Amino acid sequence: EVVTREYTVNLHKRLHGCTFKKKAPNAIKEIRKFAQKAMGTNDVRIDVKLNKHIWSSGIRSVPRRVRVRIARKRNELYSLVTVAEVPQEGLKGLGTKVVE
Amino acid sequence: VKYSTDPANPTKSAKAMGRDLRVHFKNTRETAFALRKMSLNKAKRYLEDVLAHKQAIPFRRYCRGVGRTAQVKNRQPNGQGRWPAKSAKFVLDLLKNAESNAEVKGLDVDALYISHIQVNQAQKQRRRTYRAHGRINPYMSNPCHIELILSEK
Amino acid sequence: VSLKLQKRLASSVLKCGKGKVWLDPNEVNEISMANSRQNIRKLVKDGFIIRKPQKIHSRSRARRAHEA
Amino acid sequence: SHRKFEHPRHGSLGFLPRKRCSRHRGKVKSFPKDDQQKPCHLTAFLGYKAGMTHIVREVEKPGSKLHKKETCEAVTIIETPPLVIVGLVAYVKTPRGLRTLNSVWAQHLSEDVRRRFYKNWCKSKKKAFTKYALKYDSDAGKKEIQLQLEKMKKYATIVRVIAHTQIRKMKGLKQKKAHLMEIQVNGGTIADKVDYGYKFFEKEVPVEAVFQKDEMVDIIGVTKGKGYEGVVTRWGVTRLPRKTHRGLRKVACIGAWHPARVSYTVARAGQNGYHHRTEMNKKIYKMGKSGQESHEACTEFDRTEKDITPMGGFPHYGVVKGDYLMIKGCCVGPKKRVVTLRQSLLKQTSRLALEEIKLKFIDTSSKFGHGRFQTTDEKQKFYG
RNA sequence: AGGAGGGCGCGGCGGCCGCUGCAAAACCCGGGGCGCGAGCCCGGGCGGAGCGGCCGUCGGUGCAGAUCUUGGUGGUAGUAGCAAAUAUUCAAAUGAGAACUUUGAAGGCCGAAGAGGAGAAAGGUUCCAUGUGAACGGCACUUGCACAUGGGUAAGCCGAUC
RNA sequence: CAAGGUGAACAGCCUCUGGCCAAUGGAACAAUGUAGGCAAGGGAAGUCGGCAAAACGGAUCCGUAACUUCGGGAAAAGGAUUGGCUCUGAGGACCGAC
RNA sequence: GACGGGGCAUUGUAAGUGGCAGAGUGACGAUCCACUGAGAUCCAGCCCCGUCGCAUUCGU
Ligand SMILES: [K+]
Ligand SMILES: [K+]
Ligand SMILES: [K+]
Ligand SMILES: [K+]
Ligand SMILES: [K+]
Ligand SMILES: [K+]
Ligand SMILES: [K+]
Ligand SMILES: [K+]
Ligand SMILES: [K+]
Ligand SMILES: [K+]
Ligand SMILES: [Mg+2]
Ligand SMILES: [Mg+2]
Ligand SMILES: [Mg+2]
Ligand SMILES: [Mg+2]
Ligand SMILES: [Mg+2]
Ligand SMILES: [Mg+2]
Ligand SMILES: [Mg+2]
Ligand SMILES: [Mg+2]
Ligand SMILES: [Mg+2]
Ligand SMILES: [Mg+2]
Ligand SMILES: [Mg+2]
Ligand SMILES: [Mg+2]
Ligand SMILES: [Mg+2]
Ligand SMILES: [Mg+2]
Ligand SMILES: [Mg+2]
Ligand SMILES: [Mg+2]
Ligand SMILES: [Mg+2]
Ligand SMILES: [Mg+2]
Ligand SMILES: [Mg+2]
Ligand SMILES: [Mg+2]
Ligand SMILES: [Mg+2]
Ligand SMILES: [Mg+2]
Ligand SMILES: [Mg+2]
Ligand SMILES: [Mg+2]
Ligand SMILES: [Mg+2]
Ligand SMILES: [Mg+2]
Ligand SMILES: [Mg+2]
Ligand SMILES: [Mg+2]
Ligand SMILES: [Mg+2]
Ligand SMILES: [Mg+2]
Ligand SMILES: [Mg+2]
Ligand SMILES: [Mg+2]
Ligand SMILES: [Mg+2]
Ligand SMILES: [Mg+2]
Ligand SMILES: [Mg+2]
Ligand SMILES: [Mg+2]
Ligand SMILES: [Mg+2]
Ligand SMILES: [Mg+2]
Ligand SMILES: [Mg+2]
Ligand SMILES: [Mg+2]
């Protein structure tokens, strides 16, 4: 089915104890793993702006939490993962949300 | 061409062959042993699973220093198994050749099984490696010949 | 569709480094058919090949520290 | 030639081989000797290691410098909710040793204990004991049950109860599969034992029916695993000099030229930890009974209302809501590990055995940091 | 240790007697025999053109060794190993096939007595374009300092030359 | 040939131009290694031997022994200070820099 | 299960706004004070519970 949701991924606990030269590369892999389990699609496409956001503090300081939007679409389905808009007051009280 | 085994039902059988294939002989011998009397459709799915790391190939001889996995625990209680991708892809190609040879003969793809599979050593190819104190040592590949006969029964 | 010849030619034509040449990612085929310095020039005038600006190295801090 | 200086050997040869235990639940290797004059009673119990804390008490011990003075002592908390009896097993003597005579099971077995008989409970039809339960419905089936019990009374020399824990009471264990063990009855006659164990079918036996306060017990369990380990940590040998080529964390000489073999007595690298251990003479300081004042961590000297659980829960365990034992000192294994508690095999006629413990204070500060409050109420009143 | 006799086998030459495309030599065989033995004779197969036995005589004439010579092949073994020079990621394109090719974006390194830009020795086409069977580029490649086909070095003032 | 900052400085560290991410990749963190750290209390008891490591370190002010070929020894030894900010004074040319 | 909330814990009072606080200088100005035991992080192997998901074999 075609559906779009907004998730908060806790990257801090997924990357705990990771090697410095692999923390940003592993965050990208954890994002792919998250989408495969959340929507069930083996094909996960990471948006370029989401790639920039993960890398915006270098290879070392990945953001602890990232609000992402995952849109599952028909090709055979694939997930498109993009950076979601953060409301004011941060991520406090924010669960998984359905878009449209 | 004469294979090492006659079909014993030549009208109801198809064959495929490959000489001097650049793939390790020891890896391919174990792969060929794992599907000895297998049905053609189960053999294809097994080899795709090996390519996808979902089913291991049991290494019985030529097994010294091979890890243990638990994917091979059935039909090999000690965990000695591996996933030789090149040896699996090369056999898969031969299985597709024999399958199309059977379709030309009109034999049904269903109820087809491997009645004969054989891996023989091809002539080795030479490369070179360099050692300490100005010494040269051989660096050799071990290609193989593969023979394959599918039979209805 | 390798463009390694076009990037080398554009670098020479625009008088910059290869790291300052920008080839339009949406015009990969149009740039590809070019094989002469004259064609590269026509692509520069059209706007498919651009010399990227210098990386910014500001002297603000040195000026501020010198006044201090 | 002889060695230049003497020192005792590193490690004990009495715990060999230092391998992984073949079981997870600790096993009683010897029950206490049966005294047929005493009333029928159980000799063992199963529990789960919650965590450690420290207590303060005033010591009554003449001749000691600690006499009439307070001491601080570390204690382990073992959560021990009641066991359910689900069967009986009889043993007869034989020139080859004891042999199981027969067993009788109860009509109702919970699914927690029935999970113990399956590798994959949710993929199965869950047929275990479904046809055995039909003997309790007909009249020929009930005749067999009574005949088996009468055979127990006539031929058995050892009678043991089959009991399981209520593992779902401890939610933090995250386990639905109960632990099952055989416990010996150590009183009365064989007919007394059979009658006593049969009346307990599908019934809960609390920890107070087995142990009492200020009693020395033995704790059986599997220690914490540590994986492959070198000789320095596994056996406690000394390191070599810093100058040592090819590393310094080895045994230098692993044997003489003759015998031309390595001996079983030389320290080698291998598995460290996860071993079966039987530790004895652990004193019970407290029996916390659910639904009673003894469950709280308040003493006669400290009337503060608090629970046994430290602030923020027992780290890696959770909250203790069932019955528990406070035991002096350390205990085998990590947190959540199932531990077997056994009555002492020897007579405890000693001052430490016969001492009466009176607690003055129980610490309930958080163990997840440098905790400084005893309750959440105190922490909130401090910050406003 | 050593000596001697009588025999078995290999290759020629002089003689004698034969065989073979209705299948010679060589080679293979849980085939059958003879001889104490060295050896010999036959059978079945392969192979496709030469070979044998007896008398005499002659010789580069018989192998298990020589850290023997040359060639081939094992176990070791799918093992030891592929770890210096901070580092990659995303999207797209191409292609049978992309961790490694190309484009864009991002994150990093060399840090100007450089991992930049040019020369003298030395090399000799490695330079550029197009194309790609295999080999090679100690993983891979659609890719190249590989391979194939073409193209390319202009002086009165720069040098040699004096 | 050879830029900006810090700094005495072509030291080390960071950056611009230009050039590069080529050094087989993926999964996991056992023993033993290799390279690099920390460690209470003691302080060479270790060892043939302080091997290795640690401590010292720039600049400013004070102060500096025996011995001496009178040149040195000498940075002997031994002490004190050092950030940021807001100012103040002095030192010039025909408005300026340290 | 994924978030989230609370508990527990570590560090030590966030950004921003305001102040007739502030050596002095001709608006600047280290710093200080209030909101503010604040802010940030907290299982990755911590504790307790409003939003969203969910093929291969074996017969004694
Ligand atoms: K192995
Ligand atoms: K000795
Ligand atoms: K110890
Ligand atoms: K030592
Ligand atoms: K002759
Ligand atoms: K000239
Ligand atoms: K290690
Ligand atoms: K010493
Ligand atoms: K603030
Ligand atoms: K405050
Ligand atoms: Mg190995
Ligand atoms: Mg080498
Ligand atoms: Mg050399
Ligand atoms: Mg002695
Ligand atoms: Mg025993
Ligand atoms: Mg040495
Ligand atoms: Mg703690
Ligand atoms: Mg044979
Ligand atoms: Mg002859
Ligand atoms: Mg001759
Ligand atoms: Mg000779
Ligand atoms: Mg020989
Ligand atoms: Mg010999
Ligand atoms: Mg030899
Ligand atoms: Mg040789
Ligand atoms: Mg060899
Ligand atoms: Mg290896
Ligand atoms: Mg190496
Ligand atoms: Mg690479
Ligand atoms: Mg550097
Ligand atoms: Mg740098
Ligand atoms: Mg050049
Ligand atoms: Mg070239
Ligand atoms: Mg290669
Ligand atoms: Mg060439
Ligand atoms: Mg000239
Ligand atoms: Mg210079
Ligand atoms: Mg300066
Ligand atoms: Mg410098
Ligand atoms: Mg290398
Ligand atoms: Mg690796
Ligand atoms: Mg110390
Ligand atoms: Mg001292
Ligand atoms: Mg000494
Ligand atoms: Mg000594
Ligand atoms: Mg000495
Ligand atoms: Mg030294
Ligand atoms: Mg001196
Ligand atoms: Mg929480
Ligand atoms: Mg967990």
Side-chain angles (χ1 to χ4, degrees), chain A residues 1-73 75 77-84 86-87 90-100, chain B, chain C, chain D residues 1-35 39-153 156-161 163-173 175-198 200-203 205-295 297-299 301-384:
Chain A
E1 208 185 56
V2 162
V3 78
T4 313
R5 285 190 280 255
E6 253 146 29
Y7 307 74
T8 293
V9 193
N10 192 354
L11 281 175
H12 193 217
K13 75 186 188 195
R14 272 149 180 103
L15 301 166
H16 193 256
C18 171
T19 308
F20 271 167
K21 291 308 212 190
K22 282 186 229 136
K23 221 163 176 172
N26 280 347
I28 293 286
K29 301 184 156 181
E30 292 293 350
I31 287 287
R32 252 185 245 280
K33 246 180 53 176
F34 188 99
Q36 295 185 17
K37 279 193 46 186
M39 302 258 171
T41 51
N42 224 317
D43 167 331
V44 171
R45 267 162 237 184
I46 285 157
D47 170 54
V48 286
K49 301 228 269 303
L50 188 64
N51 181 58
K52 288 184 231 96
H53 180 68
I54 289 314
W55 280 91
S56 46
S57 294
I59 208 172
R60 227 174 246 191
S61 322
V62 185
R64 279 86 188 254
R65 264 165 197 93
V66 178
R67 190 98 182 134
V68 296
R69 160 197 296 227
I70 317 199
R72 187 168 69 198
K73 290 140 159 201
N75 252 292
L77 264 47
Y78 68 93
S79 286
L80 175 59
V81 194
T82 68
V83 17
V86 180
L91 305 124
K92 301 293 161 130
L94 256 187
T96 295
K97 199 93 67 197
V98 157
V99 169
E100 186 88 344
Chain B
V1 199
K2 186 203 178 176
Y3 293 27
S4 67
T5 284
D6 301 279
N9 47 3
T11 326
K12 288 79 46 204
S13 94
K15 27 170 80 168
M17 191 255 262
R19 298 275 279 191
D20 309 299
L21 316 167
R22 263 265 263 271
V23 62
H24 282 180
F25 159 87
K26 285 179 172 196
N27 288 351
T28 311
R29 189 255 153 219
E30 323 276 345
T31 303
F33 188 82
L35 14 95
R36 257 183 308 155
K37 292 275 121 178
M38 260 213 198
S39 86
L40 160 76
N41 283 358
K42 262 145 159 276
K44 283 163 91 185
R45 195 227 39 237
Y46 178 45
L47 285 195
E48 271 107 29
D49 277 341
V50 173
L51 274 177
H53 215 90
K54 295 190 178 83
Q55 303 222 279
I57 291 265
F59 278 48
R60 321 196 163 266
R61 85 174 80 132
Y62 312 125
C63 66
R64 179 56 183 108
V66 169
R68 326 194 261 198
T69 144
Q71 260 176 45
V72 80
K73 151 187 310 157
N74 296 134
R75 62 159 157 157
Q76 171 85 106
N78 70 56
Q80 212 138 35
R82 254 179 202 174
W83 302 257
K86 204 141 129 185
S87 103
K89 191 62 232 62
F90 267 97
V91 174
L92 254 168
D93 276 347
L94 282 146
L95 282 176
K96 302 193 180 330
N97 186 244
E99 213 197 46
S100 88
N101 299 336
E103 296 214 343
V104 155
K105 279 176 211 325
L107 325 159
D108 49 325
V109 150
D110 65 289
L112 225 35
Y113 75 103
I114 295 102
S115 72
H116 173 77
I117 184 158
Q118 197 186 254
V119 186
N120 256 345
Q121 287 174 23
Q123 160 187 65
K124 302 163 177 64
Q125 305 310 288
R126 214 161 263 281
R127 274 195 301 179
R128 218 159 42 153
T129 196
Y130 306 95
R131 325 295 312 238
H133 306 109
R135 297 161 44 241
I136 302 189
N137 274 353
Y139 212 63
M140 308 302 259
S141 60
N142 301 279
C144 39
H145 310 306
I146 307 177
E147 265 164 14
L148 198 145
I149 296 166
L150 307 176
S151 275
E152 297 246 45
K153 204 66 49 202
Chain C
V1 184
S2 176
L3 297 181
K4 75 197 306 207
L5 163 85
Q6 278 80 23
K7 198 170 265 325
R8 176 185 74 84
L9 286 187
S11 160
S12 182
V13 156
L14 292 168
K15 306 195 255 160
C16 63
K18 304 207 288 311
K20 295 291 189 269
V21 175
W22 177 85
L23 313 163
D24 203 283
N26 309 266
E27 301 305 356
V28 153
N29 325 90
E30 280 88 358
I31 296 152
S32 78
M33 297 216 36
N35 45 60
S36 66
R37 290 151 168 282
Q38 184 174 0
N39 295 328
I40 297 296
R41 267 175 232 119
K42 187 56 180 168
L43 286 170
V44 163
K45 203 166 102 159
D46 285 346
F48 300 144
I49 305 181
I50 274 147
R51 195 214 286 107
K52 293 190 268 162
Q54 199 158 110
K55 301 176 198 182
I56 286 321
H57 193 187
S58 194
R59 274 193 63 90
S60 276
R61 242 182 328 270
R63 268 162 220 147
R64 280 184 267 117
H66 184 271
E67 299 295 8
Chain D
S1 37
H2 70 279
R3 67 193 306 197
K4 194 151 252 266
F5 304 99
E6 303 283 75
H7 72 89
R9 64 153 297 115
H10 304 282
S12 191
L13 295 169
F15 288 91
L16 289 192
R18 304 266 311 274
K19 78 204 284 296
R20 304 212 262 268
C21 193
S22 67
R23 62 199 81 91
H24 189 80
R25 165 191 46 106
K27 147 176 195 68
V28 173
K29 304 266 190 77
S30 102
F31 294 97
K33 260 79 101 190
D34 177 45
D35 170 30
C40 289
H41 61 268
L42 296 197
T43 57
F45 211 89
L46 274 165
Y48 296 87
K49 186 178 157 177
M52 269 201 119
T53 195
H54 66 263
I55 60 103
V56 165
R57 78 192 179 80
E58 200 164 348
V59 173
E60 169 71 17
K61 179 191 216 153
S64 186
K65 275 181 180 334
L66 252 177
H67 184 67
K68 273 186 211 269
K69 288 176 170 37
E70 48 153 70
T71 194
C72 184
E73 268 172 354
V75 293
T76 301
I77 297 317
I78 320 277
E79 199 178 348
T80 53
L83 328 166
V84 185
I85 315 303
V86 281
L88 272 172
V89 182
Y91 293 83
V92 303
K93 275 168 63 140
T94 285
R96 271 153 317 281
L98 284 189
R99 177 184 77 91
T100 297
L101 176 58
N102 56 359
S103 55
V104 166
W105 289 72
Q107 182 184 26
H108 294 324
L109 316 178
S110 85
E111 96 175 326
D112 281 344
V113 68
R114 270 186 279 125
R115 283 167 160 263
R116 184 50 72 182
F117 309 133
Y118 292 90
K119 305 276 116 170
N120 200 324
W121 167 259
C122 285
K123 282 282 153 290
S124 58
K125 296 320 172 80
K126 313 162 164 80
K127 297 303 276 287
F129 281 95
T130 42
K131 286 168 200 166
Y132 184 95
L134 298 183
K135 303 161 195 279
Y136 287 85
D137 283 333
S138 80
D139 274 298
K142 301 218 239 149
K143 232 270 190 183
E144 319 152 356
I145 302 160
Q146 211 38 235
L147 273 173
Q148 294 278 87
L149 290 186
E150 215 36 63
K151 171 142 80 197
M152 267 178 200
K153 292 168 155 154
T157 61
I158 289 278
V159 159
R160 287 199 205 134
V161 123
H164 75 89
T165 71
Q166 287 165 303
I167 202 158
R168 269 208 154 171
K169 301 300 196 74
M170 277 98 49
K171 206 143 179 253
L173 288 185
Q175 172 163 352
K176 300 147 177 208
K177 202 196 243 174
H179 288 101
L180 190 67
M181 87 173 268
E182 283 182 18
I183 303 171
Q184 198 174 293
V185 192
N186 254 20
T189 42
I190 291 292
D192 273 333
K193 296 146 144 61
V194 174
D195 291 322
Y196 165 87
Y198 187 59
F200 274 165
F201 271 16
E202 319 175 2
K203 285 181 160 202
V205 176
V207 78
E208 52 107 337
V210 181
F211 301 109
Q212 41 186 291
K213 190 178 157 299
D214 296 347
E215 178 185 349
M216 305 264 222
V217 309
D218 323 315
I219 297 172
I220 293 113
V222 178
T223 69
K224 315 168 65 203
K226 290 153 170 38
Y228 214 125
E229 192 44 88
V231 294
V232 169
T233 291
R234 186 185 198 217
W235 292 99
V237 312
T238 88
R239 301 152 73 254
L240 301 169
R242 174 210 61 85
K243 269 167 106 129
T244 325
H245 188 44
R246 291 183 206 106
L248 57 95
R249 283 184 76 78
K250 316 146 115 159
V251 171
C253 177
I254 65 154
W257 193 323
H258 284 105
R261 281 163 314 288
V262 177
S263 207
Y264 79 101
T265 57
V266 172
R268 323 275 268 137
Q271 169 82 20
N272 192 52
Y274 203 76
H275 308 309
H276 193 268
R277 288 302 186 264
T278 301
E279 176 128 50
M280 32 159 171
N281 283 336
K282 306 293 218 207
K283 198 163 172 103
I284 275 65
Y285 275 20
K286 198 207 221 226
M287 311 249 273
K289 308 294 300 164
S290 292
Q292 303 297 9
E293 151 97 11
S294 193
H295 200 122
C298 51
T299 60
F301 182 76
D302 194 23
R303 311 302 308 119
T304 289
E305 279 292 68
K306 33 184 239 187
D307 214 81
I308 194 55
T309 326
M311 277 184 60
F314 267 116
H316 288 81
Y317 186 85
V319 184
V320 169
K321 323 222 73 63
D323 303 319
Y324 66 91
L325 306 175
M326 182 177 285
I327 290 150
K328 195 227 205 169
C330 38
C331 145
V332 58
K335 336 274 178 199
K336 299 199 216 61
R337 164 85 23 105
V338 60
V339 285
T340 304
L341 282 138
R342 188 197 59 195
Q343 287 194 3
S344 202
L345 302 183
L346 39 97
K347 317 148 164 153
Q348 304 277 337
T349 58
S350 165
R351 297 238 161 138
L352 288 199
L354 290 176
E355 194 188 32
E356 173 166 8
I357 297 304
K358 189 166 288 157
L359 300 172
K360 205 159 276 294
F361 171 82
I362 322 281
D363 195 90
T364 49
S365 283
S366 175
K367 317 294 171 204
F368 217 59
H370 292 284
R372 40 171 295 210
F373 307 101
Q374 292 302 319
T375 37
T376 302
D377 195 49
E378 180 189 2
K379 181 172 154 177
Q380 273 149 22
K381 276 144 171 310
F382 174 85
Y383 284 108

